[PDB]
C-alpha cells in the first residue's frame, strides 16, 4: 500500500502469536518492541535515540508478519515508548519513501 | 524521488542560509536539528523518544529547503544526536511510504 504521513504510520504486526501495533519508522536502524514476550536465547545490546540510550534484548532470526507480508530478522525487546519497525525489516518489505 | 531504505535516508537541506544533512523520519512527529542557529523568538518545549526527553527550542514558521523543494513550519532546535525531518515537514513535501 501507499501511505501518507498525515497520521502516524501505524501497522498491525503478528509476532510469536501476538498481535501488536508498531510505527513504520524510517528514522530507525532496528526493530524495537516493548509489550512483547519472545522465547529462547538472546545477546544484550545497547541502542540509542533522541533522548539517549537503552539496554535491550537482541533476538536474532525472528518472524514478523507486518500488514500480512512476512519478514525475518533481528527484533529488539526493551523499554521503548512505542513499538517501531526499523529499516532492517522495512527493506524486507520492499518499502520505499516517495516524494 | 523514490528512495530505498538500505541506507539511512539522509537529505541535504537548506535552512536559514545554513546547509545541513538530516534523516527523513516517519517515526518523528516534529523536525529537530542540532547544529543550527536560528534568529528571533522561540517557545520552550519538550519532546521525547528512545531514552526519554530532550528540552528544545520551538521556532515557528521556519522555511526549510530539502531536495530543492520548499516547506515552511515548526523546526525544533536541541540536543538531538542527528538531524531529523519529521512528519510536519514530510507531509508538505508530499512524501509517502510505499510498501
Amino acid at each position: 500500500p501507499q501511505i501518507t504521513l498525515w497520521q502516524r504510520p501505524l501497522v498491525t504486526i503478528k509476532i510469536g502469536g501476538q498481535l501488536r501495533e508498531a510505527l513504520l519508522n524510517t528514522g530507525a536502524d532496528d526493530t524495537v518492541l516493548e509489550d512483547i514476550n519472545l522465547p529462547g536465547k538472546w545477546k544484550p545490546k545497547m541502542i540509542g535515540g533522541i533522548g539517549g540510550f537503552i539496554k535491550v534484548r537482541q533476538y536474532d532470526q525472528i518472524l514478523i508478519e507486518i500488514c500480512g507480508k512476512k519478514a525475518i530478522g533481528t527484533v529488539l525487546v526493551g523499554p521503548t515508548p512505542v513499538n517501531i519497525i526499523g529499516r532492517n525489516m522495512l527493506t524486507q518489505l520492499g518499502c520505499t519513501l516517495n516524494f | 524521488p523514490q528512495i530505498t531504505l538500505w541506507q539511512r535516508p539522509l537529505v541535504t537541506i537548506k535552512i536559514g542560509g545554513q546547509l545541513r544533512e538530516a534523516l527523513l523520519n516517519t517515526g518523528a512527529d516534529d523536525t529537530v536539528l542540532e547544529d543550527i542557529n536560528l534568529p528571533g523568538k522561540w517557545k520552550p518545549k519538550m519532546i521525547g523518544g528512545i531514552g526519554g526527553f530532550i528540552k528544545v527550542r520551538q521556532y515557528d514558521q521556519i522555511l526549510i529547503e530539502i531536495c530543492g523543494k520548499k516547506a515552511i513550519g515548526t523546526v525544533l532546535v536541541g540536543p538531538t544526536p542527528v538531524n531529523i525531518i519529521g512528519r510536519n515537514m514530510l507531509t508538505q513535501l508530499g512524501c509517502t511510504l510505499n510498501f
Partner: peptide
C-alpha cells in the same frame, strides 16, 4: 513523539 533510533 520523535523516535529516532540508531545503534551506537
Amino acid at each position: 513523539g520523535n523516535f529516532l533510533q540508531s545503534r551506537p
